[PDB]
Every structure is written in structure tokens, then in C-alpha cells.
Amino acid sequence: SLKQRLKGKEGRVRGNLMGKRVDFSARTVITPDPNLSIDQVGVPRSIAANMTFAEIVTPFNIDRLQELVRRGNSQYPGAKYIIRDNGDRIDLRFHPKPSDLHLQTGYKVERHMCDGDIVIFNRQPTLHKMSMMGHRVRILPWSTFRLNLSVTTPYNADFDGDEMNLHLPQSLETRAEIQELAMVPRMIVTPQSNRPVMGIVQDTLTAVRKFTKRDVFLERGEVMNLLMFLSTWDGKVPQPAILKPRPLWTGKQIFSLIIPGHINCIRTHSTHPDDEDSGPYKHISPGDTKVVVENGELIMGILCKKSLGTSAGSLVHISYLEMGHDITRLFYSNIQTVINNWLLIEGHTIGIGDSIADSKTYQDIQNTIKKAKQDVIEVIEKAHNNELEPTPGNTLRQTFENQVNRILNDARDKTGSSAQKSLSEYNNFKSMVVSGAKGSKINISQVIAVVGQQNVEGKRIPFGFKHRTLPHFIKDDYGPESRGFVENSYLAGLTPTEFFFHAMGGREGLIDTAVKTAETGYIQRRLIKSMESVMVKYDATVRNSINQVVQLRYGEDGLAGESVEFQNLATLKPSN
Amino acid sequence: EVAYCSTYTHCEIHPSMILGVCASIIPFPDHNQSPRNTYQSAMGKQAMGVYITNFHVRMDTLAHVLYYPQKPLVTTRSMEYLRFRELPAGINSIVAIASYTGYNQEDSVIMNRSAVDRGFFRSVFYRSYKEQESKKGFDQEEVFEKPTRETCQGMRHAIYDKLDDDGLIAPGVRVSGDDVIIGKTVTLPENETKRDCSTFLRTSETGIVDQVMVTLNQEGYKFCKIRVRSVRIPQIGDKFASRHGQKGTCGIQYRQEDMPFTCEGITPDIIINPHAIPSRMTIGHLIECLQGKVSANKGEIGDATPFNDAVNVQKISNLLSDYGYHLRGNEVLYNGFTGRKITSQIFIGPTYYQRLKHMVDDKIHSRARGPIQILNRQPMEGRSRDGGLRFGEMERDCQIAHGAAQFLRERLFEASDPYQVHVCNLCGIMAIANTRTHTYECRGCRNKTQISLVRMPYACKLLFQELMSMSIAPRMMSV
């Protein structure tokens, strides 16, 4: 019915008017490319050949467009159509008369997409503003869209079968809009959290931590090769840190050339000891933490997620705030290229040697588990004798579960800490966790020491059978193993019952993901619909479409969210 | 023992039988995170291999068969009853867990191009097209014949030379996209000759005809099935996954000279990023690499049944130590480009990798001024129909946030469904307008002078007319 057509989603009101299928759009799998800049995207030649951008013939560009017309659709840098002044369209594929090929001012040649053509790149779902960013086009010879790895974080895209949509603006006016509002370098910093959206990620973060260690010393030829991939190099080789006995540069000395201009920033490495700041060696840091950059030169410190990641006050954030968006684009790209070419010399890996720990550490983990099981048994025996006293506001069952969970969690955390002590400097799990590239201390603990307690719906594994979790356990068993504690690590391998309980926990995780996607989508749509028309007027008042004053100044101070920074008042706290 | 239960009434035959068919192919499942086993169960259904031994006789749409399937070097005991050895889906591949050039980052994979040249992960894609010569129409007969442009008033300019006399292309003839596989003609009633009814190849199929069959179907009409074969060499978009839930595309392909090499001369067939392992905690992948190295050297297929207690990482490591390698499986690698030893020692070992059905060639689409829909006069939908990608409501909200009003306008009006209507000034209702006659008149006012041209999306015109048919008057007044 008419109401049925209009009312539903995919109806005329929403499915055909608010959004609609569009021309000049392309879609294919995305794959990585460290060599492309932040703003560049790699487009396949077939996609580039089908999509055409109409160019008006001017006296300046009549020769170039004439050559494109002569090439035709077959040769790649060709023109598919000619649009005359009258509006007549001469498709060049079917034979055009040699008279028709002649061009005069006012004709519009529809050239194939060429390198340097601004496009809009999208990945569904488009949760935030950074999910549609304008990219320059670079044509490369395979059939996947290729984007730089740093740009993956705004799009929330990884290269495991993901796909992205390419929209080509078709007018000079809309092309200028994208170029000056939506390009990738212009949206490095989000107004949402006044932090940079994009940060160094994956191999480059892990390798920048290793590059910036005090240990790293580079010989002359390696310095040559690293400086070759630095786009902003002045051409002057820095004087080596160690002139004699053999000239040897340092990793920080080369990274100082990457840092843009003169940027001053102080950050702390992830492994910074808390006592160091108070005690001596505060400035001569013993562990080479406390990153300090003065005059755009890395005086000291080991770079990590905190210094080069998506957080406020990061080196990339200070670069955008101080140097500008263009120099910051070059900063991202140079970090990636130079560090990724050093990683060819150094290399990274993950193996079983990393999961395995010392025999003493394994014995310590086992002893912690033994005494934890004994403690749970004592709690159970107290409960059976009714000696346990209920916690205020909780039933005896609830307080028993609280105490048992506390014992098991303390044992779990202690085993995890023992495992983390066992890790050597060379351990690669630790390299990735310390750099912040991937993983967490929890993952190391589960790999090496103890998987931990499996909880479903916020409780230990429930009694699915009559008064027992699995048929193998005895009725009314509240002990650690019965209710789901996985004593073995992933490396050690889970026993069968632990395998089933771990599967139950993982299923809860999967269900939560699937539910959260739908519910969050509905919330986001409703918020946008409620606030879509609110905008800052030229009075600088924030008004809706009805012109009702929502706010007299935006944010009550009339400032935009991206420019602002975290600062301390310093008059508030001190005593009189 | 220390008394737990003295009244056992039954015993499990083997605990590994709790897993199903797809989870039984996972080696060392107990050493993986649970969500990763769940993901492998889904990926293993999409892997490529010989699906059935009678695949030559069968004419199925969308059949993929790998050139050189191999059975796992590290296999579960329950795989024997699944017949996975008889019909394997995947190839054991020397895999290095290393960061080489940055093209294996995220979940992508660097593959050896020389290995790909030697047969590695090569597959065939068969697509079958069916057509039926239907005489059921009263005066319509869908005869199989080769359409002729002069004889048939309805025709198309795609290539018709391939068709033989019967209207069916012979086996062994290459077919590129937009070629006529089957030529069919419907005789046209002469109300007062021929509307073309041939079937055309899916764009970019680029295959060679394998089998052409002519039979009579259940209805007794002549039935023709044509199978087109396309070889599929792995590319830098294709998706490859292991048995431990690690999926990723091919980031780049380096030749054997460029790949890193061990001292023996072994270069990895696949390089996967070290960053995939830790967060996902798929330790079974690492244990399978170690057991695969041991198996390949020893000559015996390794045992990876879930719950064994006789196979430990330490035992596998000692076994590997006997065969002259580092006990944890690490190996000293040399950089292919410069020849210098990589300072870190890379973890190299054989691991069963699968090839998933998702390939870039099937998933690449581009649209520019294509056909439009009848109802909405908007671009079609789908790769087969050359449809444009949808600019959804969330996309328009992002563009509103950007402040790019004119890109939003182009994308939502000019690129999709531009249109013009004539609207009376006195009454907002649209007015009849004869451009060729140059006379523009509005019914209901008897007014010709006051009419204005309005540019609106065709979908908006349809919405306003659907409101009018409900007796709502959307009077759009320019004033």
C-alpha cells in the first residue's frame, strides 16, 4: 500500500530520499601499503578506467585533453566521452568522426581518473566523521584499494577481507570542498575527544620502541639507507654520536631528523618507574624513560604508544597543534618509512620460545594455585559448618561467592605477575605489550601462567545439570575446578572440562558483540536525528532550524573542540 | 587415588568427541582461545579443495577445486573419520611469523610469488549457466539458434561470432565478459519479428568453456547447461586462513630472491605478522608450526588430538633439537634484498594454510553512469546489475558533520536521480508541461502564465505523487 511503501525503511522517505544508490562509486577489498602517504590511496587500473571526471576544455588545457581524446577509452590515460557545448555527448568508444574529436573551449572531456584525483573513501558502518576522509588517488597495478596503515585506526579497518567504498567528486566545486575540509591530514585531530585520531600502529610502533632504545647504534651505510627514506631530509648527515673508535649513529639521533621543525614535548614511557621522579637520576633516567624532545630533537626517552599514539599531548598531537596539518602528514609517513626499513635489519617475530617460562616460574605458579585451591576448600568447609557470617546486604550464597571469587582472582593475578616477571628483555610478547602495538599484560598472563576464571552472566559457571556443572563432577561441588577455574595456560593446554567452560565464556563474548552492534546503531541514529539541524550561526549562537537558541555561545565559550588542550590551573590547589 | 568419587557409572570414550565435524580439523584446539576456534569452524566451511571426486560429472554453479590439495602434516585422529585426508582442503605452507616489509601488517600476508608460480594455492572456478527452450507460450517459442542482427529486430552489439549453429558455444572456446554463451530467440507476435533473448556472460568471467550439455528437463523442453572454467592464480587481494582462526588477505607477493631465506635456502611461502598472535592468543598455531617442522623432518604425520597429555611443547622441542634445528623452532634468517642476517631470529615452520572462497576478482565493482531503476529512476543495486554503492543515512550524517553541503547535494541529488518538474506558482501542485509544444498549462486554475520550473530528485517527485494519491496535497510554493 502507499503507506506501506513510504513508512518502512527502504521506503521512499528514507530508503530512496535520505539515502540512495549513487553513480561514480567503486568498491573492492583493501590491502596494506606502507609506501603510500597518509592522504594517498591506491586505486586499481580497472576501477580507475571506468570512473571518469569531466574536465572543461580551456585554452590552457586544450592540448592535454586533445591527447587524452586521441588515446580513447582503450589506452588507460584516455577519455571515455566528449560533451559538447550543445550538451551532445560523443562516446569515443564507438567510432567518432575525426571532426568530432576536435576540441574547442567549453567542451567537457570526461577523462579517466588519474593520479592526484581527490576521492572520498568510506567504510561502513560510518560511525563518526573520520570514517569518510578525502584521499588523493595513486594508480597501482593490482585490484585492491591500498591505504596507509596509520589511516586504519580512524576507519576501524583491518586487512582481513574488509572492503571500502570510493566516491569520486565530479565537479571542481565539490572537489574543492573535499580538498579543504575532508582530506586526511586535515582530520588528524578529532573534535570529539580533542586527541589525534591517527597514530603510529603495528610494526612501526613496535619497531619505534626498539629503534629508540639507548642500545641501538647504526653504522654509516645503515644511516645512509634510513635517510634515503626520509622525505624531508635537508641533505646534511648528522654528526655521529660516537665519532671514535668507529663512527656510529644512534636511533634517537636519526629519529630526531624525522621530528618536524622544533617541537617541545615531555612524555613518559610505559615502563617508567614511579619512584624515579622523586629520587635521584630523575633527569638522567636509568631506564631511558621520560621522553623529552627539545627543539625538535629527541634528547632522551623510548618512544611508545604514549608518545606516538592517539592520546592527548602525544608527539603527533603536538605536531598537529604547533607545526600544522601538512608537516604532520609528512611526519606520519616518514616515521613509517624509515622505521619499517630499519625493521628489515632488526626484524620481529613471535614464537613458542616467548610463551615458555623458566622452570622456577612454573613451580611458583603451581604453588600459588595449590594454596589457592586449599583456601577455597577452607572457605567451603567454613560454609558447610555454617561458621561463615553473611556480609551486610548480601545473602550467604552471595558472600560465599564473593569470598571464593576474591581468592581465585588473587591467585590468578599473582600467577600472572609471576609469569610477567619471568619475561626477558628479548621476549617478543613483552615487546608488543610494552610498545602498545598489540596485546596486554592479561594476554601474557593467560598465555604463560593461568587462563583464569570463566564467568557467564557475571557468575561462575552455573549448574546446568542438576546441582552440578558437568556430569563428571559430583553434585554440590562449589570447588574451583568444578565451577570453571582454568588452572592451565594456553601453552599448557586446557583439560576437557576446562575446554568446555572456556567455550562457554567465549560464547558469552561473541553474543555480547552481536547484541551491542544493533543496540548502539539505534541509539546513534536517534541522537543524530534529534540534533541534526543544530548549528553555529553567524551570531555565534547555536540555533536549530526553528531559530530557537540552544546555546548563546557554542560550548559556553564559543571555541571548537579540536583546538583545546588539557591544562592545569595551578592557582586552585596550593595553600594560602 | 585420593578419594573423589568411588561410584563412577559410565566413562567417556574420548573427550575429543565433544567437538563437531568442522572443529575436529583444528589441531591443538585446547591451546587456542575459544572465539578463535569458533571462527575457524566458520572459515573451514569456506576453504577450497576437491569437494567431491565426481566433480567432473557434476554441473554445479560456483564450484572451486584446488589444483594441489595436501593433507595436514599435523592432524587430529578424528580427522580420519571425516575423510579429510581423502579430500583435503588446503596446502601445507612454510610460514614465517615475521615483520618483513610492512605489507603483512594488520592481518594481511606476504606470499612467495615464485611458489605461486609453481602451483601454490592455484584453483579452478567452474560456473554453470542453464537455459531452457520454452514453447509454453501461445505464440511465443524460445528457439535455440544463433541470432542475426539483420534478421532479428531486437539484438545486441556484444560478440555473437562464438555461437555455433545450435546457438550454444562449443567447449574449448575462450569467453570474455559480455559475450554470448547461449543464443535464444523468442518469436514475436505480429500485432502490427524478434526480441533478442540470448544469455550473456557475467562480466570479467574470462574463462574457457569446459562442457556443454543438451538434454530434456523435467518439463520435457530442451535444456542446456554450459560450464565455464577459469583458473585462479592467487593475487594480492585473496583471502587465506589457517586452521587456528587467523584470516587475512595477501598484502603483496615477493619473488623467491626477495623473500628472506634461511641458511639452507628455504624461503617462507607465507609471511604473517607477529602482531596477530598475541591479542588473539592462538598458541595452537605456534605448536602446529613446531610439530610440523618435527613431522616433516621425521617423516611421520604429527598427532594433534585435543586432549592427549602425551604431547607437550617441551617434548616436541626436544624432538626438534634432535633434527638439528633450534628447539623452539626459531631460525636465523637472511634479508633477501641485502643479504644481511636479520638480528632477530624468525620463527619458521610448516603450517597448513587454507584458501578461502572470497577472492578480490569476484568482489571488485565500479559504477559510473550506469542503468537506472524503473520505479525510482535511481542507480541499480548489485555487482551483477552494475549497481552503485548506497550512500546510506549514516553516510549523509557524516557529510553533514563535515559541512560539505555541495558534495552531499551532488551525491544525494545530482549523481543519483536528477530531475526537473514544472510547478504552478498560484497552486503548488505540479502542472502539465509540453516542452516541444512550448505550451505550459495548469489544470484547476485555468492558468498558463504562472508556472515555474523546479529541480528535485525523482524520488521526491514520486513521494509527492504518492502523497497526492493519498489525498495529501504537498503544495510546493516557490514564494
Binding site: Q453, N455, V486, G505, G509 | -
Partner: peptide, 8 residues
């Protein structure tokens, strides 16, 4: 899969 306070 860790604990009651962590993740499943």
C-alpha cells in the same frame, strides 16, 4: 574468560 571483574 579471565575473571569476575574482567571479561568472560
Amino acid at each position: 574468560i579471565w575473571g569476575i571483574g574482567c571479561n568472560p
